[PDB]
Amino acid sequence: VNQHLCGSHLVEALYLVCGERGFFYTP
Amino acid sequence: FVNQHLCGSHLVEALYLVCGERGFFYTP
Amino acid sequence: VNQHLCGSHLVEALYLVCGERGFFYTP
Amino acid sequence: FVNQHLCGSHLVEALYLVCGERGFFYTP
Amino acid sequence: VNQHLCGSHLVEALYLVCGERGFFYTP
Amino acid sequence: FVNQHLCGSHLVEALYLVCGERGFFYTP
Amino acid sequence: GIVEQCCTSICSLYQLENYCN
Amino acid sequence: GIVEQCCTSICSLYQLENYCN
Amino acid sequence: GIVEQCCTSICSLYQLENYCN
Amino acid sequence: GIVEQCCTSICSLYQLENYCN
Amino acid sequence: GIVEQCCTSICSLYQLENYCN
Amino acid sequence: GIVEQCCTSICSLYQLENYCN
Ligand SMILES: [Cl-]
Ligand SMILES: [Cl-]
Ligand SMILES: [Zn+2]
Ligand SMILES: [Zn+2]
Numbered sequence: 001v002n003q004h005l006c007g008s009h010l011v012e013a014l015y016l017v018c019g020e021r022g023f024f025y026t027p
Numbered sequence: 028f029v030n031q032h033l034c035g036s037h038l039v040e041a042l043y044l045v046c047g048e049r050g051f052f053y054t055p
Numbered sequence: 056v057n058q059h060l061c062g063s064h065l066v067e068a069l070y071l072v073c074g075e076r077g078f079f080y081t082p
Numbered sequence: 083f084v085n086q087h088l089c090g091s092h093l094v095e096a097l098y099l100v101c102g103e104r105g106f107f108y109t110p
Numbered sequence: 111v112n113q114h115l116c117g118s119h120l121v122e123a124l125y126l127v128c129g130e131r132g133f134f135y136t137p
Numbered sequence: 138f139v140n141q142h143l144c145g146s147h148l149v150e151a152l153y154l155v156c157g158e159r160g161f162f163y164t165p
Numbered sequence: 166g167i168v169e170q171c172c173t174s175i176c177s178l179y180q181l182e183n184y185c186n
Numbered sequence: 187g188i189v190e191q192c193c194t195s196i197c198s199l200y201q202l203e204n205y206c207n
Numbered sequence: 208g209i210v211e212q213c214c215t216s217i218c219s220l221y222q223l224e225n226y227c228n
Numbered sequence: 229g230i231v232e233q234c235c236t237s238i239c240s241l242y243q244l245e246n247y248c249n
Numbered sequence: 250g251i252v253e254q255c256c257t258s259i260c261s262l263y264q265l266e267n268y269c270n
Numbered sequence: 271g272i273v274e275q276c277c278t279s280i281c282s283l284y285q286l287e288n289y290c291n
Contacts, residue, residue: 004196005064006277009115010286011043015036015053016151017262017283018290022054025043026228027273028259030085030140033147034214037088038223041071045220046227047198053226054291055210059238060119061193065202066098070091070108072199072220073206077109080098081186082189083217085140089172092143093181096126100178101185102240108184109207110168114280116235120244121153125146125163127178127241128248132164135153136270137231138175144256148265155262156269157282163268164249165252178241199220262283 003027058082113137 014023042051069078097106124133152161167184188205191197209226230247251268272289
């Protein structure tokens with residue numbers, strides 16, 4: 001649960017930092 | 028470009044949720 | 056606080072899963 | 083339909099916050 | 111980390127409560 | 138006024154993140 | 166509903182308070 | 187309820203779908 | 208891509224599931 | 229400050245209104 | 250302000266950094 | 271990975287930039 005909530009913030013942050021390049025997310 | 032920037036942010040929250048353990052990728 | 060932060064994610068998730076049907080949230 | 087989808091998501095975060103213990107309901 | 115996640119919700123909540131007046135956030 | 142309300146909410150999440158320990162201010 | 170009243174103009178906190186339980 | 191079931195372990199979408207109207 | 212298909216009309220959960228790993 | 233008061237227990241809106249300009 | 254510069258076109262991270270303390 | 275590095279302590283932007291494409 002702590003992990004699952006933190007992951008939601010991570011992907012928001014990758015969305016921003018990565019820009020046009022985009023990203024992958026793997027738990 | 029701004030409306031697309033805002034929509035993209037909600038897409039990623041939705042994908043995070045839908046895909047669970049499989050995870051996802053996002054390419055603008 | 057842990058409860059209150061987690062509830063914020065729950066309602067975002069219900070927003071998505073429930074669609075046209077909508078929902079209620081009661082703490 | 084998309085602008086309404088995005089706005090609705092911020093409505094619910096606002097309601098969660100405003101209503102506290104009383105809670106709320108959301109009917110699109 | 112708990113602090114850093116909670117701060118993200120705080121600023122969303124200040125955004126709403128403060129309106130036209132706006133705010134500052136200092137960790 | 139609504140599109141500006143929604144955009145502002147994503148601005149603040151972005152600033153929180155970009156500015157770290159320095160923090161920020163938001164004046165609509 | 167909430168969408169018709171709050172997505173075409175800004176609802177204040179007092180206005181949002183109408184949709185609590 | 188939803189806080190007890192879903193803030194102590196991860197609810198799936200099917201699990202969350204239970205609390206819709 | 209996801210932007211072209213999901214930011215001009217609403218994608219359902221089934222549709223979003225196409226961009227998982 | 230706001231992290232100490234509001235991340236160890238739940239601040240109400242009136243409590244959060246304290247940190248506005 | 251931030252709204253006029255960043256809600257009519259996309260501000261980069263460098264640009265957003267102008268509104269930190 | 272990103273959960274291990276970044277949910278046990280605070281990753282900076284430069285640290286997060288590591289996981290982009
Ligand atoms: Cl959280
Ligand atoms: Cl939005
Ligand atoms: Zn959170
Ligand atoms: Zn939004």
